Symmetry: D2
Subunit: 123 residues, 4 copies
């Protein structure tokens, strides 16, 4: 799955996820969001299960982007959790949590939840 994962992925919004999978389980790369308070590339880091159960079973993985680079600071961070499924139409199906840096007035409302599907071809 190392070879499967490494590369460029696109989600349903047009965002671009460029990642390298390490042999040890590391994930490193850059993320560019087509939406929100974001411009250009942001660093990402994460992990994956580098010894999946190959018996028709996806590979677990996750990663994080803090939404600060040289251009913008959106005072927020997103984590995606999901699985890589290989094959002719390879996908990474994820859910995500986006937490914003705020005061303790709306701290109850600090996190969005959503989902992203990544494919090797761009919509």
């Amino acid at each position: 799955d190392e070879a499967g994962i490494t590369g460029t992925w696109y989600n349903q919004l047009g965002s671009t996820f460029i990642v390298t999978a390490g042999a040890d389980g590391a994930l490193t790369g850059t993320y560019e969001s087509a939406v929100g308070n974001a411009e250009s590339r942001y660093v990402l880091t994460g992990r994956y299960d580098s010894a999946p159960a190959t018996d028709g079973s996806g590979t677990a993985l996750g990663w994080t982007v803090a939404w600060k680079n040289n251009y913008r600071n959106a005072h927020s961070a997103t984590t995606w959790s999901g699985q890589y499924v290989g094959g002719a139409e390879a996908r990474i199906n994820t859910q995500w949590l986006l937490t914003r840096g705020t005061t303790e007035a709306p701290a109850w409302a600090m996190t969005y939840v959503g989902h992203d599907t990544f494919t090797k071809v761009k919509p």
Copy 2:
């Protein structure tokens, strides 16, 4: 917040999160879970907003653990998303997503959601 974050944290279950915050926004360290299919330490990586809005506002951050080390492979990965709040009782308040590597029979049921609060003193 770099100095604030770096160190050892404990959640309400007794798990131990040892992290170093980089000046650039990197998070690196190890995680030991007191529960689930887990034993000893696991690598973690993540990111944080290294230029918060200091106006009473938390620092956004997240990180990932893939639940494979030399002892066990739980074919899963967890991402935590939340915020660091500094001060006399410093906390990292998070929500988390745990995705399991499974077939496409229960792929609809691939992810748990939960929440963890981390403190500098252990319960």
Copy 3:
């Protein structure tokens, strides 16, 4: 949106959601899941915003199914939260939480998160 909502909806898994929207904001109906520990129809109840902001804006809503009927007891319950969007291809886009009745050994792992999209035509 009352007229919009009331009716039969289908999700991407083949499940069937039959609902009536009340003028007061009530939602009542039955749910049949194509997957999981489920057979035949289950009662549902929920609510919707019966005075949306009609300025291109979806209508907020949610509902609950407890997964017990005359045939099966799956000791669980699911809530869906999302929005109705009207028009030629009307949709209800939701996220959901499914909580299982368990002991306090895996209570940290009590809830799944997922997402469903409902359409008026069945896949």
Copy 4:
């Protein structure tokens, strides 16, 4: 658990949840939020597993509030999913999803996730 559930509950924010559990699995009542865009009581409806596995196991349940009453319309709705645990310190431990009625500019950001713990005594 019918007798257990029916009554007045308080969460960690000071909100008040007044509910009646039906013998058939119905939940009906009113919710008053101490926070957000909310004033006075709002109708709620939901369901619970009215034949739990009494072997130390919680009772699954959920419910919905649409945040419109005679005073305010917050164009949103919240669903809570969780479990009732009985005894000397009875609790309802939940996670929740709050979806807002918005356009398809930030539809990716339509839902918050959080968690509430309800007790029979108010903080």
